[PDB]
Amino acid sequence: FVPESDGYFHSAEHEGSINAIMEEYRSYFPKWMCILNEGFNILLYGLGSKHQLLQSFHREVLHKQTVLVVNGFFPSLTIKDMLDSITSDILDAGISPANPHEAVDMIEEEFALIPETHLFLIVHNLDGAMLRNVKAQAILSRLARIPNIHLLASIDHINTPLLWDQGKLCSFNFSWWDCTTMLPYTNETAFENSALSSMRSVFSSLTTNSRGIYMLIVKYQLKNKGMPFRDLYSSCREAFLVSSDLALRAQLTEFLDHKLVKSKREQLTIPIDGALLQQFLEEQE
Amino acid sequence: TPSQKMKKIRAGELSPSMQQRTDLPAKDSSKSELQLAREQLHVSVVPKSLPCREREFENIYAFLEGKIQDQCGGCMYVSGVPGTGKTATVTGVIRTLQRMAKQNELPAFEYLEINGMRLTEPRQAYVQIYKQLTGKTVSWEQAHALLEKRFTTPAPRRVTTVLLVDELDILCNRRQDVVYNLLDWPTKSAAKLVVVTIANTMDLPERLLMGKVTSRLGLTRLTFQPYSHKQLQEIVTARLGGSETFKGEAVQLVARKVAAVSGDARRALDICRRATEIADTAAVKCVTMLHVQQALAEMIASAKVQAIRNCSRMEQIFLQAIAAEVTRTGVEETTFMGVYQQVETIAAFMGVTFPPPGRALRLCSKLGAERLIISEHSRNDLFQKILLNVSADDIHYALRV
Amino acid sequence: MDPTISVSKGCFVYKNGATRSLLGKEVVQQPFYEEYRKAWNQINDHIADLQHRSYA
Amino acid sequence: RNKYQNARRVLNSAETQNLPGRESQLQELREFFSNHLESQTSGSLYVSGQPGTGKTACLSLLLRDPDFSKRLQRVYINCTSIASVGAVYKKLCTELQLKVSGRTERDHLEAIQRHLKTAKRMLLLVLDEIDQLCTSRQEVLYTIFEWPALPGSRILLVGIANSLDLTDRALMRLNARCELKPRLMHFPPYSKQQIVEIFKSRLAEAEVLDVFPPVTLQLLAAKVSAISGDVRRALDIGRRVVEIAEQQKRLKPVQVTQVAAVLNKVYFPLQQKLMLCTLVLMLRNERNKDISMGRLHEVYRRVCAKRNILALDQAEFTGTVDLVETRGILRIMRKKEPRLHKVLLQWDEEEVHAALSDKQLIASILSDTACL
DNA sequence: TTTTTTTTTTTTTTTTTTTTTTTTTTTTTTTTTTT
DNA sequence: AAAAAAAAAAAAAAAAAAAAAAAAAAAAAAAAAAA
Numbered sequence A: 001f002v003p004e005s006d007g008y009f010h011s012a013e014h015e016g017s018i019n020a021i022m023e024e025y026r027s028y029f030p031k032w033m034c035i036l037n038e039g040f041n042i043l044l045y046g047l048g049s050k051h052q053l054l055q056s057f058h059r060e061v062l063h064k065q066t067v068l069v070v071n072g073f074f075p076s077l078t079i080k081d082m083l084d085s086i087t088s089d090i091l092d093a094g095i096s097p098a099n100p101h102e103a104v105d106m107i108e109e110e111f112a113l114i115p116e117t118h119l120f121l122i123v124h125n126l127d128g129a130m131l132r133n134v135k136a137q138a139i140l141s142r143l144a145r146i147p148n149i150h151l152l153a154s155i156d157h158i159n160t161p162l163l164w165d166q167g168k169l170c171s172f173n174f175s176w177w178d179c180t181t182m183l184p185y186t187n188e189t190a191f192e193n194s195a196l197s198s199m200r201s202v203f204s205s206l207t208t209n210s211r212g213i214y215m216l217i218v219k220y221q222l223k224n225k226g227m228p229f230r231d232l233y234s235s236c237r238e239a240f241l242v243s244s245d246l247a248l249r250a251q252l253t254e255f256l257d258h259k260l261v262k263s264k265r266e267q268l269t270i271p272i273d274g275a276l277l278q279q280f281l282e283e284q285e
Numbered sequence B: 001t002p003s004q005k006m007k008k009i010r011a012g013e014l015s016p017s018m019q020q021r022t023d024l025p026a027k028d029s030s031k032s033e034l035q036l037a038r039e040q041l042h043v044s045v046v047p048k049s050l051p052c053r054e055r056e057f058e059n060i061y062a063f064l065e066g067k068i069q070d071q072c073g074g075c076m077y078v079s080g081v082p083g084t085g086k087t088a089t090v091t092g093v094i095r096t097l098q099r100m101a102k103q104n105e106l107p108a109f110e111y112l113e114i115n116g117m118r119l120t121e122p123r124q125a126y127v128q129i130y131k132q133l134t135g136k137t138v139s140w141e142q143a144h145a146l147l148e149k150r151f152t153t154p155a156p157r158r159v160t161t162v163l164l165v166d167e168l169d170i171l172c173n174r175r176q177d178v179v180y181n182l183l184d185w186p187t188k189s190a191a192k193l194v195v196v197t198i199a200n201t202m203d204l205p206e207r208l209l210m211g212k213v214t215s216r217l218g219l220t221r222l223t224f225q226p227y228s229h230k231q232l233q234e235i236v237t238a239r240l241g242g243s244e245t246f247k248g249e250a251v252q253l254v255a256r257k258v259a260a261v262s263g264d265a266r267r268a269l270d271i272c273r274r275a276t277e278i279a280d281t282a283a284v285k286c287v288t289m290l291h292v293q294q295a296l297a298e299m300i301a302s303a304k305v306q307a308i309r310n311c312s313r314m315e316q317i318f319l320q321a322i323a324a325e326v327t328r329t330g331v332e333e334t335t336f337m338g339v340y341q342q343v344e345t346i347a348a349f350m351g352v353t354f355p356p357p358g359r360a361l362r363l364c365s366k367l368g369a370e371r372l373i374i375s376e377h378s379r380n381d382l383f384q385k386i387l388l389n390v391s392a393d394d395i396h397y398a399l400r401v
Numbered sequence C: 001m002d003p004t005i006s007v008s009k010g011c012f013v014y015k016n017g018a019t020r021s022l023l024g025k026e027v028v029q030q031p032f033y034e035e036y037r038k039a040w041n042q043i044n045d046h047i048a049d050l051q052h053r054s055y056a
Numbered sequence D: 001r002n003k004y005q006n007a008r009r010v011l012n013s014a015e016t017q018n019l020p021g022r023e024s025q026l027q028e029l030r031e032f033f034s035n036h037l038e039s040q041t042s043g044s045l046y047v048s049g050q051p052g053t054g055k056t057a058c059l060s061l062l063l064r065d066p067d068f069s070k071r072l073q074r075v076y077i078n079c080t081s082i083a084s085v086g087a088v089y090k091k092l093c094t095e096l097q098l099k100v101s102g103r104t105e106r107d108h109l110e111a112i113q114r115h116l117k118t119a120k121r122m123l124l125l126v127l128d129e130i131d132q133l134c135t136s137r138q139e140v141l142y143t144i145f146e147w148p149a150l151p152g153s154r155i156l157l158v159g160i161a162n163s164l165d166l167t168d169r170a171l172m173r174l175n176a177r178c179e180l181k182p183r184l185m186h187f188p189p190y191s192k193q194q195i196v197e198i199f200k201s202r203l204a205e206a207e208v209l210d211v212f213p214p215v216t217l218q219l220l221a222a223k224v225s226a227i228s229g230d231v232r233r234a235l236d237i238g239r240r241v242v243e244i245a246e247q248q249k250r251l252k253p254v255q256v257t258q259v260a261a262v263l264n265k266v267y268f269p270l271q272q273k274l275m276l277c278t279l280v281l282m283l284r285n286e287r288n289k290d291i292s293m294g295r296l297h298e299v300y301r302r303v304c305a306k307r308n309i310l311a312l313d314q315a316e317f318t319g320t321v322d323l324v325e326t327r328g329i330l331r332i333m334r335k336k337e338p339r340l341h342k343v344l345l346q347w348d349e350e351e352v353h354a355a356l357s358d359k360q361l362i363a364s365i366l367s368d369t370a371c372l
Numbered sequence E: 001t002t003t004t005t006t007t008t009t010t011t012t013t014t015t016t017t018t019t020t021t022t023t024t025t026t027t028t029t030t031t032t033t034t035t
Numbered sequence F: 001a002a003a004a005a006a007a008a009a010a011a012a013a014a015a016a017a018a019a020a021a022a023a024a025a026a027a028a029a030a031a032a033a034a035a
């Protein structure tokens, strides 16, 4: 891959092949154990999802050693959670200190006391959504530098080595492997990190006066193709649809909560185009 | 040992005593009539029957008597600006109900009371409610558990309990679990709990309470309107009794000049006490109108002209020049450098020499200490922003007239 | 979609006798691993000797 | 004693046995419970609705059902009763009589997970007010809603809240798996006739039906069903009508004028008058509505000096505007200095003109542009 | 051997610090006009 | 094709409340003193 700079300045058979690919990567496991024995760490950089390959490595090979699987594609993990996991569950040493580098210091001084107790560390998506800062990669590089801890990892983002300098890459004694499966990212894109019908469904739940306030907003937006607060308050007090100002303010706040009215500074727009508002007004008559 | 004494304190077995005087207090027969008026006009001396609050007394009395007699439980919210007789009327209602219960005209009941501003956290309401039942001081988790075991479980014969909650806005926070718990326990049939909640703002249930808490709070509400000049005169002439110590026009002046500002009853009963103290040192036995005029000038203070007149000469030149920079630039917020340029212009006109900008910064800090101007920390000299806290017409009223 | 992936947890522990020489005897007693270990230990001691002699 | 106090007692706004407005919802919940009992499969459920619509009353009526009492283990947890979000495991261990080693929340979680792994009866965990468990990470709520996916676990849980889309907004990750996303059940607000039937059931519970003719019930329900639709406000106005009519008439049925007066009831000092008039004048004559306290005080002083009334200084004026804030006419945005506090009028000007009721003074102040 | 005294650890409770929310204001980028 | 300016959206303070960590005080078990 030798990219050209001029592009920047001018601006079935498949399942059998995937099974053969997965068997070919399954053959690599004794060589991976021999490589992990010499102090190197395994890194996989293929195209597709490498969750099943690392799960097969943990199942078929590491069925008796201490293993900390870390799902880095989880949108809500913290480095404190992994450090507390190591400290409390593996070493039985309680909760880790609040500064993470002191926690890695204590993990090094405690793992230096116990040789022949290897901790395997399997980080799916080392470039995950909450591991993309410099601090978590410094913590993981200090963890992988320990001779007792052996690390396997996967990377998928193309800008992954931008956060590894030469010191982190010297601590991460990586052995790079092209484990290119063609499996789709089912698990990795399932999480939170990656409308007319909703408007009708939340409009059926409102009461009568709430519907009337929203119909006043719809009629004003359809006549003028964001309405002020004073015209809405005058039209609500004319039809006796509200008692005072504060009930209307709370009702419009409820409208902001269910994504029906968007407030701007009081300008109250509906984020729906005019033809759909016309069909919606014909739906209510 | 004091640790055993504190373990007795948490158990509620030792009374929190206060020191007693070595000398016996003064007798009532030695007091002058001005002294009797000054001790009757105190705000701590509540009457047994409050004037001009008869309708609110009838409303709260009918509410609490009905909730006691039906043995059902519910809630109320009374409101009004401070000084309008809310807590005095509620405790007068509850004292009348306890006098009826001691005469077996009403079923007997328990009366717990808390205050939102006497607590360091809103969670301490559980500690202070449970302390008034048993006497024990516990943690708020155990007190919450014991209050839930008291209110949610049916146990005949449970007595009716009336919980007055002053300062309801302090018990609100973001989570709103304390106010939800206090207003949710009357909804259970096992708890014969009647909650009265006192606060200042009328629209507290819709402003900062949630929807379910406003639903539980109900709509049976009362508002205490501020005192007019007729009512606020009736209060003071009730406190004086049949004495002729106050002139009839003096109390009218106090009521007319306090009712126009706030409607507070403490304000009138403090201005009348200050007028009595003025009449005492003037060696007269009556409180005429000019004593009330001097007391009204003292209590409703306006002492910014006196501060500008007693500023030094360089301070007054600085105060003229800040107003000159406001007039020149148009905006109200001025930097120090343009103020110092106008300072040197005005000092060159007036014939004086001015101190250098360091001592001018000392003058600016000295005026900002009195809050005559608003100024920053002097670490950013020549670029700090100088608001003028006094109005520009008070400076020209003080330095010309 | 699997039991291994959870919606709440992010880290999973499989502790087997953890308290407070990875491979087996079948490869360590082989001659190629012994000669590899011996050659690597010689070369690593030689490079450490050279770096200490350069820094002294 | 008489019919009025009997009606005031029997409305009661408290826990009941009959629920005439909730018949399809109770049958649907019974069908959900019976279909998950007969297949012995676990299932989540999230019921929601406006406050006062009948959710807790329904799921407290169903946690006293004797057949579901014999077939499964019922647990009710109100979630404002917990000291923290992570204490729900401690509360559930206390409600299930589990034995823990103790003194960490993770061990309580492990004890609950072991109690779900084995079983002898099905578990029904009702978490009422489940919006109180929502946090930043939501480890607790995602841990709880994953228990139907746990292998061999038989817990079927119900979460009650007010928000229509709490499972969509605060439980986004549950949509990724069809095993995990809870079945939804909305409790719609009450209509007019449902509130009428609730009143006619509560009044026939103690045979006090003669106090309310049908016309006033059909007016009170017509207002309350249109305003909010909850039954707590309906029963509160229905109790307040009788407790006002007992004060008024001391057997007279309550008239339409009494409930109309109570329904329109539910649904000044001189310096505060002069403050409100200058705020209306400053908002009428100027298009910049960012009024500070000092800029308002300067116009107030000239308006007072024009009428030859002695004006307050800034220190009493701040307290005066603070007292007008309590009535709801204003809202004071707080800043670092009291001169720079921002007054925001929160009534329209006709409400101020009707509330001050001193139009001879109001028309005199609004015509004086020159003092601004 | 059995009762009492003093130590250490652990547990709970309170206080302080850090992190999060939440409101307001500022700065940067966008859309629309002008050359 | 490129400049500008009126407004909208990203961000930047900040300020106010809460989550969590630290620190201290009270309680349960331990080990020694002693009758």
Ligand SMILES: Nc1ncnc2c1ncn2[C@@H]1O[C@H](COP(=O)(O)OP(=O)(O)OP(=O)(O)O)[C@@H](O)[C@H]1O
Residues within 6 Å of the ligand: B043, B044, B045, B046, B047, B050, B051, B052, B053, B081, B082, B083, B084, B085, B086, B087, B088, B089, B199, B200, B235, B265, B266
């Ligand atoms: N109608 C009245 N007649 C006689 N004295 C009154 C009257 N109203 C108030 N007072 C006196 O003024 C004081 C008012 O204190 P009170 O407890 O009534 O304040 P409040 O109205 O509850 O308001 P807040 O507690 O919010 O300040 C009392 O000490 C009482 O002696």
Ligand SMILES: Nc1ncnc2c1ncn2[C@@H]1O[C@H](COP(=O)(O)OP(=O)(O)OP(=O)(O)O)[C@@H](O)[C@H]1O
Residues within 6 Å of the ligand: B187, B211, B212, B215, D013, D014, D015, D016, D018, D019, D020, D021, D022, D050, D051, D052, D053, D054, D055, D056, D057, D161, D162, D198, D231, D232
């Ligand atoms: N269908 C009904 N028939 C008779 N009474 C009812 C009905 N629904 C509710 N109520 C009564 O009205 C009150 C409403 O309280 P409920 O337990 O329904 O609150 P909720 O709907 O859970 O509101 P929130 O979610 O705000 O607590 C209850 O005391 C109940 O007795």
Ligand SMILES: [Mg+2]
Residues within 6 Å of the ligand: B086, B087, B166, B198
């Ligand atoms: Mg009070």
Ligand SMILES: [Mg+2]
Residues within 6 Å of the ligand: D055, D056, D057, D128
């Ligand atoms: Mg409920």
